[PDB]
Ligand binder design. Sequence first.
Ligand SMILES: [Mg+2]
Ligand SMILES: [Mg+2]
Ligand SMILES: [Mg+2]
Ligand SMILES: [Mg+2]
Ligand SMILES: [Mg+2]
Ligand SMILES: [Mg+2]
Ligand SMILES: [Mg+2]
Ligand SMILES: [Mg+2]
Lengths: 385, 385, 385, 385
Amino acid sequence: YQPTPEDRFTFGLWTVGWQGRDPFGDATRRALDPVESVRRLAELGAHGVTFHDDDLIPFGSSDSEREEHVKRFRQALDDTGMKVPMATTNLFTHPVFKDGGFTANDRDVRRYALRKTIRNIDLAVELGAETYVAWGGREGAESGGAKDVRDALDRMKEAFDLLGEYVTSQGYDIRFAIEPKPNEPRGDILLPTVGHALAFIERLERPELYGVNPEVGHEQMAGLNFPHGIAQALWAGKLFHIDLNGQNGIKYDQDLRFGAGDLRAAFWLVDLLESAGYSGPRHFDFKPPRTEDFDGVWASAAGCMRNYLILKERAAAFRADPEVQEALRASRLDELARPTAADGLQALLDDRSAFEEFDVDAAAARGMAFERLDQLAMDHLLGAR
Amino acid sequence: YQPTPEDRFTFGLWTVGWQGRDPFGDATRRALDPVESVRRLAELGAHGVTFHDDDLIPFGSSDSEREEHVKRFRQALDDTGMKVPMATTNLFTHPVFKDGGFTANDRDVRRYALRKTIRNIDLAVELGAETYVAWGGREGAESGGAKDVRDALDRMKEAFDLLGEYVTSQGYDIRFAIEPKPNEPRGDILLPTVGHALAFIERLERPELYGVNPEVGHEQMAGLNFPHGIAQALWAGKLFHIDLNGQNGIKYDQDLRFGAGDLRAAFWLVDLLESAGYSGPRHFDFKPPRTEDFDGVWASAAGCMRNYLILKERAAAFRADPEVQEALRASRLDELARPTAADGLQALLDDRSAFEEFDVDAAAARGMAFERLDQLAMDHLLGAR
Amino acid sequence: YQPTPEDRFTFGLWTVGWQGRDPFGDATRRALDPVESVRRLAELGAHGVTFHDDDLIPFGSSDSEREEHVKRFRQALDDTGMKVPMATTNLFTHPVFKDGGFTANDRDVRRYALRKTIRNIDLAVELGAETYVAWGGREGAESGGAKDVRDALDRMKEAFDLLGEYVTSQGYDIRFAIEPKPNEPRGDILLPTVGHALAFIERLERPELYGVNPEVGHEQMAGLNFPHGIAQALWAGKLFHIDLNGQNGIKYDQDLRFGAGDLRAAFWLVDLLESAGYSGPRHFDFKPPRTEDFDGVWASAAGCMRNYLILKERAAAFRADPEVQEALRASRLDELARPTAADGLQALLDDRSAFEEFDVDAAAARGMAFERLDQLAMDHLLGAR
Amino acid sequence: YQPTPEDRFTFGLWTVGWQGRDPFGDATRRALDPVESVRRLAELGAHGVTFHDDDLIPFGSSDSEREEHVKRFRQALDDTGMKVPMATTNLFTHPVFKDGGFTANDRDVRRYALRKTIRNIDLAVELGAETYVAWGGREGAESGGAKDVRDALDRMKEAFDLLGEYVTSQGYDIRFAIEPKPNEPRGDILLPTVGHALAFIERLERPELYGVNPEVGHEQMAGLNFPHGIAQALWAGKLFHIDLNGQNGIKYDQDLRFGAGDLRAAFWLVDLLESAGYSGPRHFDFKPPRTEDFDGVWASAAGCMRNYLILKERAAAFRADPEVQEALRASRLDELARPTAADGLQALLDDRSAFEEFDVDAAAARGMAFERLDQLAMDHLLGAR
Ligand SMILES: [Mg+2]
Ligand SMILES: [Mg+2]
Ligand SMILES: [Mg+2]
Ligand SMILES: [Mg+2]
Ligand SMILES: [Mg+2]
Ligand SMILES: [Mg+2]
Ligand SMILES: [Mg+2]
Ligand SMILES: [Mg+2]
């Protein structure tokens, strides 16, 4: 189970670079030179890396230092062949963003947030990024009076609309992906789930420029079924990017390596991604636990990719099994894919077999055979067939 | 704090009529004649009632018994002046719906679900219903292989599209409201939150015919902020109906009387509903606990309305307080309502005060004063000012 | 992976016998004759069955019908060789228990609950039960004023103390096991977790007669780590019985088949049960989903046992792997098992290497190597080594 | 509603002193001199302050600087009259504690944790602390193989037993209080709830020296009823100290000011504390949100005390209302307080009115009248009577 760049595995600089600074504790690891991360990730078989503006260029850098950091970074890309498919803006670390970026109550902060974003979009295009992610981590509230949510959604739409005006006026080939999260670091965050972000996008001036970047652990922090949410995003045509990691239920955002947390949900996610032909990056937004030293960092990152590849093989074996294919017919998955009333409304109204002569007791007595199917899926996952 | 029909308080027949049958226990109350509920609710000051088809007409009734039940019901409406603003279909109780109604794997069940719905839409229009609610309680899955969610969303869209074809071909003035719920009775339910339903509606043939019917306890079963979700629905123009009740966090659907559960969320909900001028029914979907006899049923129903009216007075006092209005300015709620860049993109790019000469340290040091505002809201809620 | 009675797999009559009646729906399966369940479970390789008094003897049966039901049941045991290791009382279904059994506010109900329990203890001893389980499903509250919890704990202690007086005065060799649950069907239930029950037992007159019967899904309804809780119960010497099933996070009590829900928690549970030498029944308290017919019932029950046996093999392979054993030493699990200060308090105070000359920076820089260990456990679970 | 030192309100130095450093953001406030906090808290009417060793004496201070910091602190106590009722050890911030303090896998860290604790116990006694709190924030695991929980409980017992040997050998009049928390910063923390800590204490050599320090938000992070848990702790005689704050359901540990979060739970908590005559400190472990400047810090701290005092008045008015007292009799709270069978086991067995002649249908038809009682409590809380 060895990854190749063909597998399109990508990592954020801030992931393997996380120093272990948590709400109750100081850092446990020194900082990583972004050049060193690129080289170690290329050795592990990764396809590319992603970045926040502030990961690459330390905040408040002069134009000249800015240029040094980019040229060093670009040289590591050329030496390794690594790509940069995605980039994003840090609108959450600096104290100025304590009430948000695009939806801060203070107008001058909102204008500053836009300028900081536009500057990094230029840089992301230069480095070849296809997707630009927006995580509004500080957009939200701890108390109800602090934020009028209708006004804040007006400001949020205004920000995204101007960003789309900029990329089209510049003739850039880049698309935006909104990343939802229900809470943390704010008490409640705006657009808290995949569904709220999809709904919001349909009100933008240019909906076709925006999609979602869902993260495994984020939807699970609301107790939701992550493969169900990904299916709705694919159904809407909006799965532009995806963040893979692990999460053990409803609690703080753990960012465990992918495959940890809910293992069966990971199995059904890979099954969905592979059968639907998702072709974007398989990005890992995770944190090697602060118990680890640098050898444990690279072991954890390696494990993300290995676990995806094992699950890919198990899901492919599950769908190819003739015994599973007959189980799928036994549970009538084939009939789910068939139109309910392609004969049309009027034919439906006149069809006595649909109501007057429908035998409800006969239909009700039919078992769905879902438990035998699910045990076949379990046996496959576990390699017990 | 006495309700009048002017307050537009409505109750489902299945609410005060719930016999106490729960997963682990038999009924504790006899059944209520729907005529008797209408009269007792009219005495308490309610504006109207709602119904499932199977609440009013017991399942499998002949055409003749059907007509008797409707005429008895209509007579109670005329005697009391009570209205019927909303109606809905039971697609969850009969065993035939064990894998869903509109998204059952079996095609013939899906056709039967549509015919059962269309029959009740005719009856709801006859009784003057403005809104027709759809709660897909059985649309979902306990296991991942059992339901292809993309296919099921195709079937769900097909069902709602045909329903909209029917109402427009009949020239009916009625609109649909989808009611989301994350889980129970299925392990995960499709369209699990307000956001997922709003997103789904934008893919229907005739989006303008569909809105949402959110329920307090349902969004709280996912840990979400219910007033935030209602604000997004109002922002989208889709709050057609609302279900009020109480819920104590993430657990089974409690359906406590309104005001129980999360009291401060109820305060902020009423504040939002009243300041935005929501003018639809204030519907209570609740269950008097099975510890209660019939006197406790009517006490619980009375309490729903009383608690709304107390919170309405407290929220109105909060917004009218000049001290609160200056606190709102101190926290810059006025600046949130102001466009970020009405001067436009190009003016923003050239505005040096927005980036090159923005003093981030000065902006960052400004306190938001959110805690003083929130304590003013607490004092108001508690009547301690 | 075929079960034998040697594996000590047991099932409740109410499990495979559940008709599918849930809060929102009627039954989907006919009732099962307890004789028929015993025979079908013996065919699947189960070791035995358990019962509530009301599962075996329908409520309100005359003495004569009572005797018929027992003799029929006993004959099925003798024909099959099946055992009855555990029994329990239904103090939750009849409306009389709507405010609880042992802690009902009405004194006469509490006395009735005790008499109903004592009658079934006699029957359980006759049938050879070793353990008598108490699940206080109705002991709790929906509102805060309804129950003084100190008084209710007094009543709860009084009930359990009298039950222990009865078994010792009768010279019975049977022990009690309290089954915790955080909520449902009450809004909050008393003794909501394994920890609260262990604490409560230490206040009984005869603590040695009482232990816990924890259930997988119940502790997970509070977001807790079920293997951690089982370890604390083993540590205290109180794991008398255990209920195995599956649960997908914090929501209504799903009672999925064992191995469904949180798969990695099931792996770590079996690892703990097997390495600690738990020798009691492996009882399954689960519900075949109501989507299923009777063939799906037996497939689901079969799956409970299969999944335990697959996980037993994987956990045994994990602990026997020399590479894992060196990984365990690398993470210092061996040092965790060693006393911190067997040299004693005074030696500790004088040990300069423990404080004055302790190199905190050297200790802090040591990686725990926990991620490599956990990936070895994942590879083992998945059969990828 | 003005606090006096008589009200016994206390604050941690780390509370009003929190700089706003969260997992995703830098500090938003400068550090507070502990002398300045003591003076500002004395002005607000607080009774006293608490501290971690590392709050008062910066880590790694020489003996001489140590003495300066204590003398400065003591002078502020003498100038203000403020007390120090409680103290605790920081065994979570320094990287050396990344796998725990008392249960770290590395033996030498465990010995260091004990020495660091013993040093601060000496200082707490000098300053007059009555209670010494232990929060094992790093005792736990992110993965299942990393910690054998039985071994870790052995080490945990060994640590607490040696601490009790030290205080008794020194003739100190101080008691220990264990503070539970379910998770964060570890994935699961040992002794995760009030119940698990009470159970654990009964296995210590000297149980009478140990009690619990429960925190509002911590039990709510597991979805538990905090007033129920406090009642069990009072029932066991182990409520030595309590931490008051606010929490909005199951998510990261918010540490909102007291009265925020679940308002009705706060009402029932104060009702319980006041009616049971809890006489220890009313300690606030909270965090002024990082949106706030220093004026907002003191407003938030003031609000903690105000909200306790408003709720104290409302709960006292509720219990003194004759209409409530008759409602309590109507719901049979008086009968809950009465022994179930003071006549004894044999009298119970022979009492035909308890079983043979018990009218279950008559008892079952009695309403509990719990909803009318709860609405009286709501009206009282809201000042609507
Ligand atoms: Mg995350
Ligand atoms: Mg992410
Ligand atoms: Mg509900
Ligand atoms: Mg509803
Ligand atoms: Mg259960
Ligand atoms: Mg059970
Ligand atoms: Mg806390
Ligand atoms: Mg605390």
